[PDB]
Design a protein around this ligand. Sequence first.
Ligand SMILES: Cc1cc2nc3c(=O)[nH]c(=O)nc-3n(C[C@H](O)[C@H](O)[C@H](O)COP(=O)(O)O)c2cc1C
Ligand SMILES: Cc1cc2nc3c(=O)[nH]c(=O)nc-3n(C[C@H](O)[C@H](O)[C@H](O)COP(=O)(O)O)c2cc1C
Ligand SMILES: Nc1c(C(=O)O)[nH]c(=O)[nH]c1=O
Ligand SMILES: Nc1c(C(=O)O)[nH]c(=O)[nH]c1=O
Lengths: 306, 306
Amino acid sequence: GSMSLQVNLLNNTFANPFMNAAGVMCTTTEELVAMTESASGSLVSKSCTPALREGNPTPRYQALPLGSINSMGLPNNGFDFYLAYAAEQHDYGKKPLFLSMSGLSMRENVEMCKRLAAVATEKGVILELNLSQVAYDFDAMRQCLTAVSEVYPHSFGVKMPPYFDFAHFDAAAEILNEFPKVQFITCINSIGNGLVIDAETESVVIKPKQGFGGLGGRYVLPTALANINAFYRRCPGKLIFGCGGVYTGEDAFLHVLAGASMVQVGTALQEEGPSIFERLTSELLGVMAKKRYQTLDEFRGKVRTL
Amino acid sequence: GSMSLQVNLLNNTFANPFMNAAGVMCTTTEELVAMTESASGSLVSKSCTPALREGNPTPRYQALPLGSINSMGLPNNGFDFYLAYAAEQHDYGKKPLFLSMSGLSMRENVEMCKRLAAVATEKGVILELNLSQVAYDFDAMRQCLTAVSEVYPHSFGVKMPPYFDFAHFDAAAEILNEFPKVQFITCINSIGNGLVIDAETESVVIKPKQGFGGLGGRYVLPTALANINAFYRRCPGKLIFGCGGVYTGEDAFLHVLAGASMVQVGTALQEEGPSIFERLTSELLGVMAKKRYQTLDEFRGKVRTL
Ligand SMILES: Cc1cc2nc3c(=O)[nH]c(=O)nc-3n(C[C@H](O)[C@H](O)[C@H](O)COP(=O)(O)O)c2cc1C
Ligand SMILES: Cc1cc2nc3c(=O)[nH]c(=O)nc-3n(C[C@H](O)[C@H](O)[C@H](O)COP(=O)(O)O)c2cc1C
Ligand SMILES: Nc1c(C(=O)O)[nH]c(=O)[nH]c1=O
Ligand SMILES: Nc1c(C(=O)O)[nH]c(=O)[nH]c1=O
């Protein structure tokens, strides 16, 4: 009978594991408010750079039968804006808040983190540092985490690009394991630089980068699951946030089974809007009721191998 | 008007660009014969090691709604077998033959190539060197190609794992461009180490490697197109063979638009059997008819960017 999607991590309680994926429906005040008013357990603001960015020329996003492709190019209101939202506007009474940071250089991250620190202390906003590029360069990654850890006296998480072999899972996990402050790992950012071609128009579907763009949605689910689980296994001291290919409570069930604590929703949210969180909570509860699970902790990470 | 799927490359004529992906339906004599008797323009033998390999424990392949996952583990009849097939049995009158080679070390590839050379000379079998792991380690990749190029007195092709960013496309192309004997690049091998989880059983679906395995099929098409196109652009001296996500003539059309000369079919072929090539040729012809193309040359690599 009695079930709960409650998640507890980083001294916070989340009503449920769902949140937007960074960059989806979280750029403007209006979006952040809608995410906060939504049934989501949490939200994360658009990955920010120190100054506003208009991002790439349009079209830079295309929804697809099997997901999405994008090359948004970090359009965002700038760090000050997301800092102010976290410091002054966000209703922490409603749900915890993650702030995604994507400085274009290590120095930019360091300088933003210096300023984020006080707000994290005061309001409890949690950094998701977008490493996804940095995450495909392990030396740079360690360097970056060192620099940020030096100036940011709080736990935070990293948003990772997907990896595709155990050597990379091992190497990434080894670096992340060097940093106790990295308390969560978000797997995954989009599968990088896919190329969608529309057979009718015989063209690509997005303008930037000759049509090459990050894949999200149903394309990425097994890759997301792999990475969630790969890091779940290799970083037992950390939590994993799942991101990639979640359209239904069943998809979310798979993320959690693979090891996810929070489950982020990108493409599906972009296509459906924040009402999706009511559906997803209801669907995950339904999947759990059918499977006789009462809590997420009961099956998180418990995917059975053969 | 008159249409033709004919492809001319590597001093050969192909009735059409279709062939099996290495490792699919090309391990046994019967499979090779069936591929030869099929409507495909060519075939490639299962990636071989010097000796017979039993491969990984089963289940090691699973068909999925969006494609497939596998960790076959190079089950193959051994090099002598594929070499003998190429030397003694294959009917080159029907179609050219590619031999896929995947030695477990540089040494093995060298020794097999040394022996393959004569059969390539006499019979015209074309090596597809499986680099896909080696191709994710650019030094190992350089070393592998240097070694093979040193001992193997023929043009050959390389089967590439997918890359996911331009830095990698550039790095790989730079390396490939340093080897004039590499005259085709097959993009792509499976998307590595996805993890399929069956929500019903709460388990992975293949046994080896904790359920992690290469993704093929619908999952991989934009990644395949990206890679085909990325290397099509960066290796203008070379042919690109497309592989990944081809189930229909329209998919094939996308491959060719992206730059593919040959189009390899794995997952779809696994599920449908070699009769698929009759459907694929018909479908591709139909797509070309509706679009008023008469030859593949007319649109190969002509994907329009915005
Ligand atoms: C339009 C769009 C914008 C995105 N912006 C960001 C971003 O700013 N920062 C980030 O880390 N990921 C960003 N992502 C990637 C998502 O956070 C997520 O990692 C990816 O889309 C996979 O999730 P999905 O399959 O639910 O779409 C974006 C994705 C999309 C489609
Ligand atoms: C069962 C199976 C066996 C495969 N064996 C090989 C192989 O031996 N050598 C190789 O280069 N690729 C192998 N592959 C990868 C395919 O050749 C192809 O690169 C990949 O499956 C993507 O094509 P697809 O989407 O049509 O399946 C195999 C794939 C599958 C599913
Ligand atoms: N910053 C990101 C973007 C973007 O284009 O802004 N798109 C993504 O898919 N992932 C990111 O991390
Ligand atoms: N050798 C390969 C296999 C295999 O399992 O043998 N599976 C793949 O997906 N790709 C390969 O190159």
